[PDB]
Amino acid sequence: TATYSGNPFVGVTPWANAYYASEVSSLAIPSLTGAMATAAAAVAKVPSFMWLDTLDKTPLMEQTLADIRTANKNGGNYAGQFVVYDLPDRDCAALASNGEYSIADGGVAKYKNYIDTIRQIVVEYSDIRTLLVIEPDSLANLVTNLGTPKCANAQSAYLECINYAVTQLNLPNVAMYLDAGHAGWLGWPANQDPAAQLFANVYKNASSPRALRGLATNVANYNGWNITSPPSYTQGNAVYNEKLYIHAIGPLLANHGWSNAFFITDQGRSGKQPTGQQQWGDWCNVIGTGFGIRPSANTGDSLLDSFVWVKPGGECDGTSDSSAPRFDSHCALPDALQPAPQAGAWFQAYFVQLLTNANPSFL
Ligand SMILES: OC[C@H]1O[C@@H](O[C@@H]2CO[C@@H](OCc3cccc(I)c3)[C@H](O)[C@H]2O)[C@H](O)[C@@H](O)[C@@H]1O
Ligand SMILES: *[C@@H]1O[C@H](CO)[C@@H](O)[C@H](O)[C@H]1NC(C)=O
Ligand SMILES: *[C@@H]1O[C@H](CO)[C@@H](O)[C@H](O)[C@H]1NC(C)=O
Ligand SMILES: *[C@H]1O[C@H](CO)[C@@H](O)[C@H](O)[C@@H]1O
Ligand SMILES: *[C@H]1O[C@H](CO)[C@@H](O)[C@H](O)[C@@H]1O
Ligand SMILES: *[C@H]1O[C@H](CO)[C@@H](O)[C@H](O)[C@@H]1O
Ligand SMILES: *[C@H]1O[C@H](CO)[C@@H](O)[C@H](O)[C@@H]1O
Ligand SMILES: *[C@H]1O[C@H](CO)[C@@H](O)[C@H](O)[C@@H]1O
Ligand SMILES: *[C@H]1O[C@H](CO)[C@@H](O)[C@H](O)[C@@H]1O
Ligand SMILES: *[C@H]1O[C@H](CO)[C@@H](O)[C@H](O)[C@@H]1O
Ligand SMILES: [Co+2]
């Protein structure tokens, strides 16, 4: 019902979900006052993506869509934004993943069951345009981390599952963007063609789904969209910002059979450049970051359908508690803000850091 032609971000308005607004209003604002408290309240109104990282989270997707349906009846012209993130043996390169499904334990079957719940929801809410980011931190590993056994052994499962998700969610009211890492990952010249080759193969293998509009980049990362000078940590890589990355891989996708692929790029934590990253590969609660460019389809660059906020600022990337199960040492590095809670949990000090270093400012 909520069909569209071309850029799915045009003709609609991204919904700022109640989940994130609850976190900010009930977990952050009570600790703030004056200017900060008022600025914080405005952050809750910026639309970001809701992550469906567990099967238990799926009911929240419907509640969100239900809120949208109600809003849309009253002049509302909103669209839902969700991240599909629950592949079996998820985050194969990490020493310890929080993923709930394991390939060796009927993981692929469970993933398909997971996708089935989501498709049923989208079909029930066909009247709502649904924008989806497909499995961050998955396909990118197949380009550079096959040297890691867990990744080598998960390749076929990753490919099978992603093919199931894209074909089953290929609906008229849906727009999917395959996670494609970021400039510092696949942007390196040597990784470009192999990456394009892979994404194009996933597209064609899924019979060129009309709903698969393109790729998503910088998800949960901090790269600049169009910074004019190379940060020290990007040395050696000519592709040091996301604009350069999509313009590099874009033509290669077409060379490999995927024409008319577009992109969306995360800027939710890219507001301050350069970041406090000591190494480009430092991904956990990086210090020296701020909210970035606001979600908008007026990108001034046709390859980019829209600036977006996929990783919600304030929600932790991982704990710095070394006694916690699945603790990752990257979250205890000198350039990671600590002490930090479990991944996904509210991290007040990081929210304040983002708000404080926001550009455009909220204050
Ligand atoms: O905040 C939304 C969503 O965030 C999840 O946490 C994210 C998981 O992916 C991480 O990026 C990939 C990665 C790199 C290295 C090791 C590992 I293990 C993963 C992001 O940094 C992180 O923010 C969180 O799990 C989930 O609950 C939450 O809904
Ligand atoms: C193509 O789809 C099948 C479906 O099972 C999957 O197993 C395979 O890995 C996919 N190939 C690629 C390159 O995505
Ligand atoms: C980068 O993009 C933002 C938003 O589109 C814009 O305001 C800014 O002028 C751009 N910077 C450059 C150097 O073009
Ligand atoms: C669904 O219908 C709308 C309005 O007619 C179109 O714009 C879209 O292309 C799809 O066919
Ligand atoms: C989404 O947001 C509002 C409508 O609710 C408008 O400003 C915009 O054009 C779009 O409809
Ligand atoms: C609103 O929802 C958020 C997200 O679950 C909670 O953190 C908050 O306590 C309130 O229930
Ligand atoms: C959470 O609630 C507060 C107060 O109602 C708002 O100011 C904020 O924008 C968010 O909706
Ligand atoms: C955040 O959550 C609290 C309950 O923990 C609510 O009272 C508040 O309105 C907001 O939803
Ligand atoms: C908000 O932040 C304050 C400290 O700034 C805490 O004391 C409070 O519990 C909440 O986390
Ligand atoms: C933040 O600022 C607003 C006015 O802009 C106040 O209404 C609020 O109480 C807080 O001081
Ligand atoms: Co229902």
Structural description of this entry:
- The protein has helices at 18-28, 34-43, 58-73, 107-124, 141-144, 149-168, 189-205, 242-255, 348-356, and strands spanning 13-14, 50-52, 78-84, 130-134, 174-179, 212-217, 262-266, 304-308.
- With 363 residues, it is α/β, with parallel strands linked by helices.
- The chain has a single domain (1-363), classed as 1, 4-beta cellobiohydrolase (TIM Barrel, Alpha-Beta Barrel), CATH 3.20.20.
- Strands 1, 2, 3, 4, 5, 6, 7 and 8 form an eight-stranded parallel beta sheet that branches.
- Helix 1 (18-28) packs antiparallel against helix 2 (34-43), helix 4 (107-124) runs parallel beside helix 6 (149-168) and helix 7 (189-205) packs across helix 8.
- It is globular and about 55 Å long.
- The termini are far apart.
- One alpha-D-mannopyranose binds next to helix 1.
- Belongs to the glycosyl hydrolase 6 (cellulase B) family.
Domain count? 1
Broad CATH class: Alpha Beta
Distance between the termini: 39 Å
| DSSP helix fraction | 25-40%
Q: What descriptive keywords fit this protein?
A:
about 10% strand; binds a molecule of 3 linked components (XYP-BGC-IOB); 9 helices; monomer; eight-stranded parallel β-sheet; binds cobalt (II) ion; binds alpha-D-mannopyranose; alpha/beta; cellulose binding; about 375 residues; identical protein binding; disulfide bond; TIM Barrel; about 35% helix; binds 2-acetamido-2-deoxy-beta-D-glucopyranose
